[PDB]
Symmetry: none
Subunit: 440 residues, 2 copies
């Protein structure tokens, strides 16, 4: 890694200790998905390892109002993870010390700002808030390195292996003995569920035919002769390699790098921890997720795993609705529409999973639509190959949403928009005209 | 390629291990004190850790009936003997609890064991000298609990030199099982000793297998070599220039073409070395009777324990150099069917065998003529005979010649065809050497 993205790692650590010695309760503010939760986890644990105290706040969004209210608070050091780079001068109205460990496009006399974009690395491909927070805490605690990779996996910075800064973290964790590697099947929750649910709940990497379908996973295993009601390590080795060769035919990306650390044994691999923490964040059950990062494992784990079961039944219900209804295709896009309450807060995820599964055509860009009273919430999702031909959903949605009075934006591969219910057809024709312009 | 017999006994062994692990009890590991023995215990220890079990290791130079007698007092319900056991099986069977023996030496004809699981390649039609070591046998006992230990099975293999033209048999089955599992990578490169930890001049000078005639065991010569051919002599192997690197590949291959070949790296041993560097670290630990350091390496300890392990290898290697220097000067005397070298020097007393072997690979001493290394030990003399496979093919068996010859003067001897030992009274040494000479001439 660059000496810049490392020398700033050291200023961050040195400021953390000048408050830890001064006996002060360090203030952690972070985001509410796997990257945000695990990042706070990294800082929390750094702080615990030196008998320090901390107070976490988990937000869906950072607003100037929250930062205004923060300026009333005693707490001498503020630690923003996975957010901060958008509101830096507003933050600088805060006094004390302040650390911002983000990785989003940037926009500080007492402010330490660490962000990969400022040191020539891609904050979308190579480093997440959890890794950035690790680089701020590396000289206090290196035992947190595996959690840095949970957040990375959380934000999907993994396609053909951890790249860049995250690779530097994996190999730093490997040398340090806290993170082991082995190639295996990457089924969801291999220690906690029997083989039929594990397969059915493997959403990434997808298994077309099997993923999100219980009877189909059961009948599959029945016919090929492996114990459908036993958990993955309890089978017979002759029954095991039927599975490796069979699942690799359906999707060969199923076999690959698995990441295990001893502290997460009997929960799962590192990408199982990304799953538990995301499910905790969707349920606004922050505390359970952070307790996992901190090492709590009695009934807090039991509650976390119950949350993931219920989130996963919803996703299945879910893809089932998509397999039956299907999508309508215009010229340069396809869309799917729901007024059903169950699919309102998952429309994005199921949209994405249905492309990976080839239920819906992954080449044609997909807009998922949830009615929200008199408006409609839009989650656009596509595949990298559609981006290479010229698609940018963020630009198309922002422009298209704006023109009817609605707000939209996001990335090239995934974008959102909110539009009035009465303008939906027109909007969909307008996103269709823009995407056709974008590609030919 | 692996017989269902050698895997079905692999399964009994595993299933007995779990009936004690579930019963909450501290499994007893007893193993030998070289790379195979140490790494084999490592394999079992790690199997046991992966299921939150506990273990207690004992590392011995030799297994004696006395130790086994004392073991019967212990308590520990399951005993796991690695790289030893097949010689003392009925004695072992006097032990109660359960017992696993993961060895690869010639079994003794009394295969008894009501509660004893005996796994040994010789009993399932494989060569325990060429194709499977204790570490691999121990892997076959633990394969259905943990496959992440597969690279350590190959350290022990390399430790006992089960590698000439690639891992054969069972060990090949392990390399390809490790490869599929993603824990062991392969690539062809120069096979220099300790490429990450030492600068190029010491790395060359410390490459004892494969040998580099001219360069191995000689610091100034390695230095002058690299000086003259224009490669940075004081930089470590990956820090050179690629144009400076392939001067090296083509130059070292002229001196010994076996230098280029299969290298084995596993991620857990990164920044220590390749798998045959781990064999080196562990042997050096065992020679120094420093057994918790070597096992800590197998278990993944890597702070000051690695620092201590590497300092032990530097000191063992300076000894070996001192060493071959003594042999390059002050050479061997040749009779008719053998040659010998003699030392009363304390430094060369516990390495005579190794330097004897390295000097044949280096062609300092003639590899065709069988070589006896001799250390005075007060009123006796310890003999380490060593030769090359081509001398075996013409009819040499050092074990038979030494046992018979040693015996006839009241001394003990034996071993294999390629390497043997003997202990004889100092006053009978010339006669003995004439007698080993007459026997080897008869043999060929
Ligand atoms: Mn993030
Ligand atoms: Mn986030
Ligand atoms: Mn052995
Ligand atoms: Mn041995």
């Amino acid at each position: 890694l660059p000496d810049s993205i490392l020398k700033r790692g050291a200023e961050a650590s040195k400021v953390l200790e000048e408050h830890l010695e001064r006996g002060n309760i360090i203030r952690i503010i972070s985001h509410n998905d796997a990257d945000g939760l695990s990042a706070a986890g990294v800082v929390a644990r750094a702080i615990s390892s030196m008998n320090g105290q901390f107070h976490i706040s988990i937000l869906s969004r950072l607003k100037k109002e929250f930062i205004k209210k923060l300026s009333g608070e005693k707490y001498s050091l503020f630690f923003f993870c996975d957010m901060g780079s958008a509101y830096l001068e507003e933050i600088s109205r805060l006094k004390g010390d302040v650390i911002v460990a983000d990785h989003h496009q940037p926009s500080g006399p007492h402010v330490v700002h660490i962000n990969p974009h400022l040191h020539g690395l891609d904050g979308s491909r190579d480093l997440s808030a959890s890794g950035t927070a690790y680089l701020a805490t590396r000289l206090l605690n290196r035992k947190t390195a595996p959690l840095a990779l949970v957040g990375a996996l959380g934000d999907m910075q993994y396609t053909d292996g951890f790249t860049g800064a995250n690779r530097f973290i994996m190999e730093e964790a490997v040398e340090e003995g806290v993170l082991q590697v082995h190639s295996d099947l990457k089924l969801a929750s291999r220690y906690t569920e029997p083989l039929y649910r594990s397969i059915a709940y493997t959403f990434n990497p997808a298994l077309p035919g099997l993923t999100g379908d219980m009877e189909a996973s059961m009948g599959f295993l029945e016919n090929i002769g492996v114990s459908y009601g036993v958990k993955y390590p309890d089978l017979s080795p002759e029954e095991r390699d039927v599975l490796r060769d069979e699942l690799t035919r359906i999707n060969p990306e199923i076999f690959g790098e698995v990441f295990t650390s001893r502290e997460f044994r009997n929960i799962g691999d590192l990408s199982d921890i990304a799953g538990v923490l995301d499910a905790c964040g969707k349920n606004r059950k922050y505390g359970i997720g952070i307790g996992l990062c901190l090492g709590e494992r009695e009934g807090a784990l039991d509650v976390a795993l119950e949350l993931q079961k219920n989130y996963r039944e919803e996703l299945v219900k879910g893809l089932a609705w998509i397999r039956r209804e299907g999508s309508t295709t215009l010229e340069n896009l396809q869309y799917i529409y729901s007024e059903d309450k169950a699919f309102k807060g998952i429309m994005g995820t199921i949209a994405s999973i249905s492309l990976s599964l080839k239920i819906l055509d992954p080449d044609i860009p997909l807009l998922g639509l949830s009615r929200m009273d008199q408006h409609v919430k839009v989650s656009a999702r596509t595949t990298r190959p559609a981006v290479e031909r010229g698609v940018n959903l963020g630009v198309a949605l922002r422009d298209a949403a704006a023109s009817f009075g609605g707000t939209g934006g996001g990335h090239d591969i995934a974008a959102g928009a909110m539009v009035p219910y009465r303008d939906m057809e027109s909007f969909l024709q307008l996103v269709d005209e823009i995407l056709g312009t974008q590609t030919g």
